[PDB]
Design an enzyme around this catalytic site. Sequence first.
Site, PDB file in Angstrom:
ATOM      1  N   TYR A  97     -30.339  54.756 -14.505  1.00  0.00           N
ATOM      2  CA  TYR A  97     -30.008  53.337 -14.501  1.00  0.00           C
ATOM      3  C   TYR A  97     -30.960  52.560 -13.603  1.00  0.00           C
ATOM      4  O   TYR A  97     -31.456  51.492 -13.980  1.00  0.00           O
ATOM      5  CB  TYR A  97     -28.559  53.131 -14.049  1.00  0.00           C
ATOM      6  CG  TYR A  97     -28.251  51.693 -13.712  1.00  0.00           C
ATOM      7  CD1 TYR A  97     -27.908  50.792 -14.707  1.00  0.00           C
ATOM      8  CD2 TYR A  97     -28.303  51.235 -12.400  1.00  0.00           C
ATOM      9  CE1 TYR A  97     -27.637  49.476 -14.413  1.00  0.00           C
ATOM     10  CE2 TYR A  97     -28.024  49.918 -12.095  1.00  0.00           C
ATOM     11  CZ  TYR A  97     -27.689  49.043 -13.107  1.00  0.00           C
ATOM     12  OH  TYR A  97     -27.407  47.728 -12.819  1.00  0.00           O
ATOM     13  N   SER A 115     -31.191  44.723 -10.062  1.00  0.00           N
ATOM     14  CA  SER A 115     -30.229  45.489  -9.285  1.00  0.00           C
ATOM     15  C   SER A 115     -30.819  45.890  -7.940  1.00  0.00           C
ATOM     16  O   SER A 115     -32.023  46.126  -7.812  1.00  0.00           O
ATOM     17  CB  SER A 115     -29.775  46.747 -10.041  1.00  0.00           C
ATOM     18  OG  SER A 115     -28.858  47.500  -9.268  1.00  0.00           O
ATOM     19  N   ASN A 172     -15.363  58.386  -1.910  1.00  0.00           N
ATOM     20  CA  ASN A 172     -16.396  59.387  -2.176  1.00  0.00           C
ATOM     21  C   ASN A 172     -17.300  59.497  -0.953  1.00  0.00           C
ATOM     22  O   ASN A 172     -18.272  58.755  -0.798  1.00  0.00           O
ATOM     23  CB  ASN A 172     -17.191  59.022  -3.425  1.00  0.00           C
ATOM     24  CG  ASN A 172     -16.318  58.908  -4.659  1.00  0.00           C
ATOM     25  OD1 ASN A 172     -15.226  59.475  -4.716  1.00  0.00           O
ATOM     26  ND2 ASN A 172     -16.797  58.174  -5.658  1.00  0.00           N
TER      27      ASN A 172
HETATM   28  N1  LIG Z   1     -21.961  44.944  -9.064  1.00  0.00           N
HETATM   29  C1  LIG Z   1     -22.353  44.432 -10.229  1.00  0.00           C
HETATM   30  O1  LIG Z   1     -21.598  43.944 -11.058  1.00  0.00           O
HETATM   31  C2  LIG Z   1     -23.825  44.467 -10.563  1.00  0.00           C
HETATM   32  C3  LIG Z   1     -24.749  44.915  -9.626  1.00  0.00           C
HETATM   33  C4  LIG Z   1     -26.097  44.940  -9.949  1.00  0.00           C
HETATM   34  C5  LIG Z   1     -26.497  44.520 -11.195  1.00  0.00           C
HETATM   35  N2  LIG Z   1     -25.593  44.092 -12.089  1.00  0.00           N
HETATM   36  C6  LIG Z   1     -26.110  43.651 -13.409  1.00  0.00           C
HETATM   37  O2  LIG Z   1     -25.474  42.494 -13.807  1.00  0.00           O
HETATM   38  C7  LIG Z   1     -25.381  42.451 -15.249  1.00  0.00           C
HETATM   39  C8  LIG Z   1     -23.955  42.181 -15.670  1.00  0.00           C
HETATM   40  O3  LIG Z   1     -23.155  43.265 -15.266  1.00  0.00           O
HETATM   41  P1  LIG Z   1     -21.528  43.160 -15.166  1.00  0.00           P
HETATM   42  O4  LIG Z   1     -21.198  43.668 -13.788  1.00  0.00           O
HETATM   43  O5  LIG Z   1     -21.049  41.818 -15.616  1.00  0.00           O
HETATM   44  O6  LIG Z   1     -21.166  44.297 -16.277  1.00  0.00           O
HETATM   45  P2  LIG Z   1     -20.210  44.082 -17.603  1.00  0.00           P
HETATM   46  O7  LIG Z   1     -20.262  45.391 -18.323  1.00  0.00           O
HETATM   47  O8  LIG Z   1     -18.927  43.439 -17.216  1.00  0.00           O
HETATM   48  O9  LIG Z   1     -21.047  42.937 -18.419  1.00  0.00           O
HETATM   49  C9  LIG Z   1     -22.127  43.274 -19.251  1.00  0.00           C
HETATM   50  C10 LIG Z   1     -21.924  42.634 -20.624  1.00  0.00           C
HETATM   51  O10 LIG Z   1     -23.042  42.967 -21.453  1.00  0.00           O
HETATM   52  C11 LIG Z   1     -22.591  43.312 -22.729  1.00  0.00           C
HETATM   53  N3  LIG Z   1     -23.510  44.190 -23.406  1.00  0.00           N
HETATM   54  C12 LIG Z   1     -23.814  45.493 -23.110  1.00  0.00           C
HETATM   55  N4  LIG Z   1     -24.682  46.016 -23.921  1.00  0.00           N
HETATM   56  C13 LIG Z   1     -24.973  45.011 -24.810  1.00  0.00           C
HETATM   57  C14 LIG Z   1     -25.830  44.928 -25.924  1.00  0.00           C
HETATM   58  N5  LIG Z   1     -26.589  45.945 -26.339  1.00  0.00           N
HETATM   59  N6  LIG Z   1     -25.876  43.769 -26.589  1.00  0.00           N
HETATM   60  C15 LIG Z   1     -25.124  42.752 -26.182  1.00  0.00           C
HETATM   61  N7  LIG Z   1     -24.289  42.710 -25.161  1.00  0.00           N
HETATM   62  C16 LIG Z   1     -24.251  43.868 -24.509  1.00  0.00           C
HETATM   63  C17 LIG Z   1     -21.215  43.949 -22.487  1.00  0.00           C
HETATM   64  O11 LIG Z   1     -20.392  43.930 -23.615  1.00  0.00           O
HETATM   65  C18 LIG Z   1     -20.664  43.094 -21.354  1.00  0.00           C
HETATM   66  O12 LIG Z   1     -19.998  41.961 -21.867  1.00  0.00           O
HETATM   67  C19 LIG Z   1     -25.943  43.785 -15.746  1.00  0.00           C
HETATM   68  O13 LIG Z   1     -27.290  43.582 -16.098  1.00  0.00           O
HETATM   69  C20 LIG Z   1     -25.822  44.675 -14.505  1.00  0.00           C
HETATM   70  O14 LIG Z   1     -26.734  45.729 -14.456  1.00  0.00           O
HETATM   71  C21 LIG Z   1     -24.284  44.054 -11.799  1.00  0.00           C
HETATM   72  C1  LIG Z   2     -25.053  47.917  -6.866  1.00  0.00           C
HETATM   73  C2  LIG Z   2     -26.047  49.018  -7.137  1.00  0.00           C
HETATM   74  O1  LIG Z   2     -26.885  49.295  -6.292  1.00  0.00           O
HETATM   75  N1  LIG Z   2     -26.039  49.685  -8.330  1.00  0.00           N
HETATM   76  C3  LIG Z   2     -25.161  49.544  -9.489  1.00  0.00           C
HETATM   77  C4  LIG Z   2     -23.803  50.247  -9.240  1.00  0.00           C
HETATM   78  O2  LIG Z   2     -23.260  49.967  -7.978  1.00  0.00           O
HETATM   79  P1  LIG Z   2     -22.487  51.114  -7.084  1.00  0.00           P
HETATM   80  O3  LIG Z   2     -22.720  52.424  -7.764  1.00  0.00           O
HETATM   81  O4  LIG Z   2     -22.831  50.896  -5.647  1.00  0.00           O
HETATM   82  O5  LIG Z   2     -20.979  50.555  -7.408  1.00  0.00           O
HETATM   83  P2  LIG Z   2     -19.562  51.273  -7.018  1.00  0.00           P
HETATM   84  O6  LIG Z   2     -18.663  50.226  -6.430  1.00  0.00           O
HETATM   85  O7  LIG Z   2     -19.109  52.145  -8.142  1.00  0.00           O
HETATM   86  O8  LIG Z   2     -20.071  52.282  -5.815  1.00  0.00           O
HETATM   87  C5  LIG Z   2     -20.053  51.904  -4.462  1.00  0.00           C
HETATM   88  C6  LIG Z   2     -19.510  52.993  -3.550  1.00  0.00           C
HETATM   89  O9  LIG Z   2     -18.108  53.207  -3.779  1.00  0.00           O
HETATM   90  C7  LIG Z   2     -17.858  54.567  -3.985  1.00  0.00           C
HETATM   91  N2  LIG Z   2     -16.666  54.750  -4.802  1.00  0.00           N
HETATM   92  C8  LIG Z   2     -16.655  54.359  -6.113  1.00  0.00           C
HETATM   93  C9  LIG Z   2     -15.589  54.506  -6.915  1.00  0.00           C
HETATM   94  C10 LIG Z   2     -14.382  55.096  -6.401  1.00  0.00           C
HETATM   95  O10 LIG Z   2     -13.349  55.288  -7.009  1.00  0.00           O
HETATM   96  N3  LIG Z   2     -14.480  55.464  -5.064  1.00  0.00           N
HETATM   97  C11 LIG Z   2     -15.552  55.327  -4.230  1.00  0.00           C
HETATM   98  O11 LIG Z   2     -15.495  55.694  -3.071  1.00  0.00           O
HETATM   99  C12 LIG Z   2     -19.150  55.095  -4.607  1.00  0.00           C
HETATM  100  O12 LIG Z   2     -19.201  56.484  -4.503  1.00  0.00           O
HETATM  101  C13 LIG Z   2     -20.191  54.337  -3.776  1.00  0.00           C
HETATM  102  O13 LIG Z   2     -20.374  54.964  -2.530  1.00  0.00           O
HETATM  103  O14 LIG Z   2     -22.839  49.957 -10.213  1.00  0.00           O
HETATM  104  C14 LIG Z   2     -22.674  48.603 -10.588  1.00  0.00           C
HETATM  105  C15 LIG Z   2     -21.578  48.530 -11.623  1.00  0.00           C
HETATM  106  O15 LIG Z   2     -20.402  48.050 -11.018  1.00  0.00           O
HETATM  107  C16 LIG Z   2     -23.996  48.039 -11.114  1.00  0.00           C
HETATM  108  O16 LIG Z   2     -24.488  48.748 -12.220  1.00  0.00           O
HETATM  109  C17 LIG Z   2     -25.003  48.112  -9.966  1.00  0.00           C
HETATM  110  O17 LIG Z   2     -26.276  47.652 -10.339  1.00  0.00           O
END
Ligand SMILES: NC(=O)c1ccc[n+]([C@@H]2O[C@H](COP(=O)([O-])OP(=O)(O)OC[C@H]3O[C@@H](n4cnc5c(N)ncnc54)[C@H](O)[C@@H]3O)[C@@H](O)[C@H]2O)c1
Ligand SMILES: CC(=O)N[C@H]1[C@@H](OP(=O)(O)OP(=O)(O)OC[C@H]2O[C@@H](n3ccc(=O)[nH]c3=O)[C@H](O)[C@@H]2O)O[C@H](CO)[C@H](O)[C@@H]1O
Lengths: 340, 339
Positions: free
Chosen positions: B164, B140, B225
């Site tokens: 996190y 992340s 926010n």
């Molecule tokens: N903006 C983003 O989406 C973003 C940003 C940074 C990092 N990530 C990372 O990318 C990865 C995927 O995130 P996502 O956005 O698809 O979230 P998501 O919640 O859509 O996908 C995560 C999946 O993992 C599964 N999971 C959770 N806990 C589990 C467990 N104990 N055993 C098995 N499966 C489990 C959930 O059921 C879900 O299907 C995560 O590691 C997240 O931290 C995402």
């Molecule tokens: C990307 C990052 O560095 N950290 C994590 C976090 O991202 P973020 O916490 O950056 O994801 P987000 O889209 O919830 O937040 C981005 C921005 O949008 C703002 N906001 C959010 C919701 C809303 O209703 N209004 C609003 O203004 C929030 O306050 C922030 O300033 O969450 C993700 C889940 O999707 C992943 O876990 C990422 O790893």
Amino acid sequence: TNRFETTCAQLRAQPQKWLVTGCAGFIGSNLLETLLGLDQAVVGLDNFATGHQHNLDEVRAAVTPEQWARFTFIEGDIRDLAACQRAVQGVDRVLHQAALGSVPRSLKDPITTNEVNIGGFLNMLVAARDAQVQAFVYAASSSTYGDHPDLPKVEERIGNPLSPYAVTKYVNELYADVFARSYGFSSVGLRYFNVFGKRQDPDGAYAAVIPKWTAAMIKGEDVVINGDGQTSRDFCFVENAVQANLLAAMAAPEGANQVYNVAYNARTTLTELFEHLRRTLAGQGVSYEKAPVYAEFRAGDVRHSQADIGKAGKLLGYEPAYDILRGLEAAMPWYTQFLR
Amino acid sequence: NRFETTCAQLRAQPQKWLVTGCAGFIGSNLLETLLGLDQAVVGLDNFATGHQHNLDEVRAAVTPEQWARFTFIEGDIRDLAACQRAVQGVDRVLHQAALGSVPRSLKDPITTNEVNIGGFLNMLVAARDAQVQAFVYAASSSTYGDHPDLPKVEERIGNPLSPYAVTKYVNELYADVFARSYGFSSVGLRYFNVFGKRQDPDGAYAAVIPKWTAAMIKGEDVVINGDGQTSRDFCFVENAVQANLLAAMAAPEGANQVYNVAYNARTTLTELFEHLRRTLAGQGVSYEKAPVYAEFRAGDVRHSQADIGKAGKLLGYEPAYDILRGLEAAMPWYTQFLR
Ligand SMILES: NC(=O)c1ccc[n+]([C@@H]2O[C@H](COP(=O)([O-])OP(=O)(O)OC[C@H]3O[C@@H](n4cnc5c(N)ncnc54)[C@H](O)[C@@H]3O)[C@@H](O)[C@H]2O)c1
Ligand SMILES: CC(=O)N[C@H]1[C@@H](OP(=O)(O)OP(=O)(O)OC[C@H]2O[C@@H](n3ccc(=O)[nH]c3=O)[C@H](O)[C@@H]2O)O[C@H](CO)[C@H](O)[C@@H]1O
Ligand SMILES: NC(=O)c1ccc[n+]([C@@H]2O[C@H](COP(=O)([O-])OP(=O)(O)OC[C@H]3O[C@@H](n4cnc5c(N)ncnc54)[C@H](O)[C@@H]3O)[C@@H](O)[C@H]2O)c1
Ligand SMILES: CC(=O)N[C@H]1[C@@H](OP(=O)(O)OP(=O)(O)OC[C@H]2O[C@@H](n3ccc(=O)[nH]c3=O)[C@H](O)[C@@H]2O)O[C@H](CO)[C@H](O)[C@@H]1O
Ligand SMILES: [Cl-]
Ligand SMILES: [Cl-]
Ligand SMILES: [Cl-]
């Protein structure tokens, strides 16, 4: 008077209720004896993974019956959050020592070390936060310096962790800092440097160097030096660590949310350590006429470790009273009696 | 382009993959792409935050022949026996299973720690013992913490600001330690605010794009926010898909590395609101209400932009989607999904 003397008088006149996790272990049981010797009420938490019932019995024999009556022991696991909440209830000061040391142990079984040291630590941190304890001092490690070369080791300059164990101890500091940011929960981490003294387990596959060599020399077995023997360490007598825990627990907010080196700021090579053990043991009627066996280096060994303790002195009043030689003189008799 | 070469190579020489979190947002997009390349894929998911309907949607998109190459395991990465079953016979692992939502971790740090550190370590050990050819895991951009320098370079990070962020950083620490101690190589992908189809909008912890999109489709209020200048490097999910496959097939001179996965661009929250309103309007969806400006969200970084030069040089990462093109592709999924 140094700050430790003032703190002991303050605690004796104004008792707190404490929690010592890992109280059945080496450092934990030394903290328990000192706190009960100050007329404190103490709660203990230990699952006997590496500590021993006989460490508790020795503390019981050393304190007065009145003091032992103030000790509540809980056999429990810090991986179980309900156990942590039970242990911290009604507690003012927490001294968290429960963990699985031994970098070598973490390499064989990284999962168990992670579960106890990170998972268990996080359970304790949350339980203490919810119970609103006044202080939370936790055992950190000098392994957090990792591969950073600078000597002496200063708290704000660290390096990459080199073992699964080093990862867990570094993560304890990361979660403690995050809990200060998000919830305002203060804590003090104490990076121990090679603590030694009475009741450090000499048995086991993962025994520390001083207890291991001491038992071998008492038994007349071979003593092995991993490397060329000039590998140096800052061996810290356990009483110095005890002083650090009490000062940290009673520190003001300037001294809280901090990490401190806990050592003597001194260098002792492994060859010098063998000589120190040989002379001290000779004073106890123990002959050891064999020479050390110099073998290959142990994977992941830092070659030189010496600690800058200026931060602990300035902010906590930490003045360690025992160098390595004085600690060995006091500790060697414990091992002759225990291993006889 | 390196990515086109990789896809053609995979089609002629199919590998067996494992995608944990396959029922989730990024995992299900990876599953669709891999099955669309005629790969055999194993899945592991406990449906903690993913949905069965994401898996069914993937089946509708791929041919029956490709879906036949998919084995799904309902299981928990906290259960080591599940991880060992999942990695058996596998060549490439794409570990996505985790619990996102910084806000979730502040409410319940213990559960997030259990899955993201404990579960990650179970997967890392299981893959090591099975001797997989590659292990790419989701990191992340939160690992940069409070570091002020912009754009973000991999070698300059700061202190984690949430539980996190601690867990995601610990993933990189364990991967580096496993390379030192056991010779096991792996690639971490620091995602920057990934968005696209099948990112859950129906959640208390929904990301900003899916939440605002669902509210605007339904005509509900949209809340920003802070002051609205908070900027992010939004990465369309297909860019992340490319990064996973390039990382998975890279040589060791590209493994045991951590890479930023983003577009190297800035988008404030107010600009993002403008983009969502405009894209939805292009699909006949009107939203005439103004944003509601509220207080800042606890612990959120104010500005995040990624330098992707490292991924370009070592992996051939050439992202194809800017934020606007990704939004145009993703919005139809949300109009269809809600209706
Ligand atoms: N903006 C983003 O989406 C973003 C940003 C940074 C990092 N990530 C990372 O990318 C990865 C995927 O995130 P996502 O956005 O698809 O979230 P998501 O919640 O859509 O996908 C995560 C999946 O993992 C599964 N999971 C959770 N806990 C589990 C467990 N104990 N055993 C098995 N499966 C489990 C959930 O059921 C879900 O299907 C995560 O590691 C997240 O931290 C995402
Ligand atoms: C990307 C990052 O560095 N950290 C994590 C976090 O991202 P973020 O916490 O950056 O994801 P987000 O889209 O919830 O937040 C981005 C921005 O949008 C703002 N906001 C959010 C919701 C809303 O209703 N209004 C609003 O203004 C929030 O306050 C922030 O300033 O969450 C993700 C889940 O999707 C992943 O876990 C990422 O790893
Ligand atoms: N020189 C050193 O010994 C040294 C150096 C650096 C850091 N430390 C740290 O200091 C602390 C104490 O170390 P020690 O040398 O006294 O080790 P030790 O093994 O003698 O004592 C540790 C105690 O913790 C207990 N314990 C372990 N896992 C537990 C669990 N899950 N639940 C409850 N109790 C559990 C053990 O049973 C034992 O009583 C540890 O946190 C260790 O990492 C010690
Ligand atoms: C990072 C750290 O603090 N790790 C642990 C370990 O630190 P250390 O690994 O620093 O302590 P140790 O006593 O295991 O090793 C210290 C030094 O002695 C050397 N040596 C050791 C044994 C032997 O038979 N011969 C020999 O030469 C060893 O290679 C090293 O150079 O010590 C204690 C017991 O393990 C505690 O568990 C510590 O938490
Ligand atoms: Cl247990
Ligand atoms: Cl949810
Ligand atoms: Cl854990």
